Amino acid sequence: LKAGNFDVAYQNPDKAIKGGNLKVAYQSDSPMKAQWLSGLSNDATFATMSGPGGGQDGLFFTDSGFKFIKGGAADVALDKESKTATITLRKDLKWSDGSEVTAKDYEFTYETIANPAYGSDRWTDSLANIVGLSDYHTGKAKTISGITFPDGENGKVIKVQFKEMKPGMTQSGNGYFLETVAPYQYLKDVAPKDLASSPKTTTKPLVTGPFKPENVVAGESIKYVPNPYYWGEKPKLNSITYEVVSTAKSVAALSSSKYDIINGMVSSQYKQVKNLKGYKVLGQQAMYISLMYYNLGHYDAKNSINVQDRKTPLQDQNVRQAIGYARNVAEVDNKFSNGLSTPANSLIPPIFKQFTSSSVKGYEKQDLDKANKLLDEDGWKLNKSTGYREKDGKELSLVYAARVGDANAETIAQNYIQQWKKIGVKVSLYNGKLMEFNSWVDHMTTPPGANDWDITDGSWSLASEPSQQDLFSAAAPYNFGHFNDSEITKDLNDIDSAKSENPTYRKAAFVKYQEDMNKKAYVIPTNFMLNYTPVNKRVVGMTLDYGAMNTWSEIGVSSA
């Protein structure tokens, strides 16, 4: 497997020893917050650092596209006609004290999120689609009627009944049902309001993963040791340490061999890392899209709907396409990205092979000739004295709300402004300078929307169920440019329809959506990204494959 020029795995020619200590770090300038219950945890840093311990007790394995497969701590099966997901825990699934993981432990996760007495921030409207769960959530019911136990609470099977099936239910991260267990017998006598701050969920938890936390240093680190009761094979390693490292100290830590692996390293730091001997740098495509937005309307908050009613030459499809074709995204990525940005052909990255195809063509190749032709044929005619096109005596002049963030952000925006000059479009930065991130978020998300920008850039961390209703639907506040198109609405709905419970149909629906979005050009995909990870050359079995389910048990070292 390759991701760009990067290897996804480090194929160590040397065998792993039996034993050893692996030292891993996560780059963060903010402390970890240890919370072992998924429902009560809001810290992404700790969520990653929980990996050796089971990832906050995740149950389901997936393929490399995040589609559920059998063979993990539990299996999940959908039955359309029952409207039910059935979760079957393995016979051998135990907690790290040797207690059995039972059906109650899965139901208890739902209580931790849905009963407000626990203080969870993770309730979502999606959960209201489980029979009886909204009523449990609001106190109307004392149990969750939609969750049943074919073989009792102390058996291994849980049935979850829905009001409606959803096609995303075969993707991890879908949110319509949950994927973790919580140790009910261990935690049952803690008052719900005290659970999140209990030692039992912070410093001294029970877990289900290949390692268990022997010591947690608040804000900083976890020492992991083998979990005797893990259902899989014993791990190779005798211990793993997982520590927070600051951005400012990561490279030196690599120089000093303090860590074998550092995760979360940002795109900036790379050329300091890429030359360091003794490391193999692996890469993987990120769950990420960046894109260019055109401002085409406003958001009606009272009616929760985008109205595409702004006066702008960008209402013309030809103009939107031309401005897309004029960019030099590939060249910009070559010049500046250190290889960590690659041009997007579509709005969904190819991580999701079941929802994407490289056959989908977008604006990944500059085409100034096409851009100039589109504008000409739309009556935007090139003025001799100025070098800019006009229609009814008005120049084609746009405001670009480019933002701070990328290290070469200024330079990149200027690249684009210069390409746009080549097609006779005059483009200036919003107030003559880059917008700070918080100001940009405010500008884009405060209804009804501003009228003083034309072009902007946005970027998103995508969920492993990648429907984009929350980004581009007519009702979405995140639809920053406020387009509303009947064909796109039909396409978005088709992706989430009952017919899309069939994966071949859903693929086709995603592909049509991606093509239609490109053609309409209300938004223009810009880049995908690559995450990089330095790995000490002694590490054996390391891979960033999203399909690799057993890495913590398999990983080892070739020498102590």
């Binding site: 949110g175 990420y288 998103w460 169920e465 984009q468």
Partner: peptide, 5 residues
């Protein structure tokens, strides 16, 4: 499900 970033 998706967040700015």
């Amino acid at each position: 499900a998706h967040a700015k970033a």
